[PDB]
């Protein structure tokens, strides 16, 4: 489905995004060069704290867009979970974790994956509360529900591939997680398609959002 863009800024260089020096070092050590259209448009309003709706296809640079925005906002000495990322699958959740960790490794920002027969992961969380959790909706709601994860400091909530998550039956978990977050929480939703039930999430959970369409 199709949204209309509404934001002004475009930034063609990661040098120009006001990133912390070691975040930038981390981005370049990883092998990113110049920002793609999504990164040029969306990184700055995400870091500014605005609700963002980004419609962009796969292969366009989304992961790095929110990985970078999230890492820039982290209060590094606040040993607490500060940002939550939802993905429709475990492999996509792990891939997101491996970008965030590889950039965060230059700043000392921690990131844990929260996925579905090993539940020793549900203990070990009791070294650090990680700064960033990435997970699938059932698993993340489980940890909120049973209080292994605290919503108290979560002040960034990212929904990657929102359409896929709805298609996979995750609307109750997502809404339940929404209800458990602080009313003040920044929401970033990314999706290739924007059908009405995706849009309804944006209507229930976002306020005066930034709208970015990257055309395929």
Author numbering: 21 to 136, 139 to 238
Give the article text.
DExD/H-box RNA helicases, from virus and bacteria to eukaryotes, play important roles in processes including ribosome biogenesis, RNA processing and folding, ribonucleoprotein (RNP) remodeling, RNA nuclear export, the regulation of RNA translation and transcription, and nonsense-mediated RNA decay. DExD/H-box proteins often contain accessory regulatory domains and localization modules, but their cores consist of two RecA-like domains joined by a short flexible linker. The N-terminal domain is commonly referred to as conserved domain-1, or DEAD-domain, and the C-terminal domain as conserved domain-2, or helicase domain. Both domains contribute to the binding site for RNA substrates and both contribute to ATP hydrolysis. We used X-ray crystallography to determine the structures of the DEAD-domains of DDX2A, DDX2B, DDX5, DDX10, DDX18, DDX20, DDX47, DDX52, and DDX53, as well as the helicase domains of DDX25 and DDX41.
DDX2A (eIF4A1) is essential for translation initiation. It is part of the eIF4F complex that consists of eIF4G, eIF4E and eIF4A. The eIF4F complex and eIF4A are potential targets for anti cancer drugs. Motifs Ia, Ib and II seem unaffected by the state of ATP hydrolysis, and their conformations remain unchanged even in the crystal structures in which the nucleotide binding site is not occupied. In all single DEAD-domain structures, α-helix 8 has adopted a position that would block the RNA binding site.
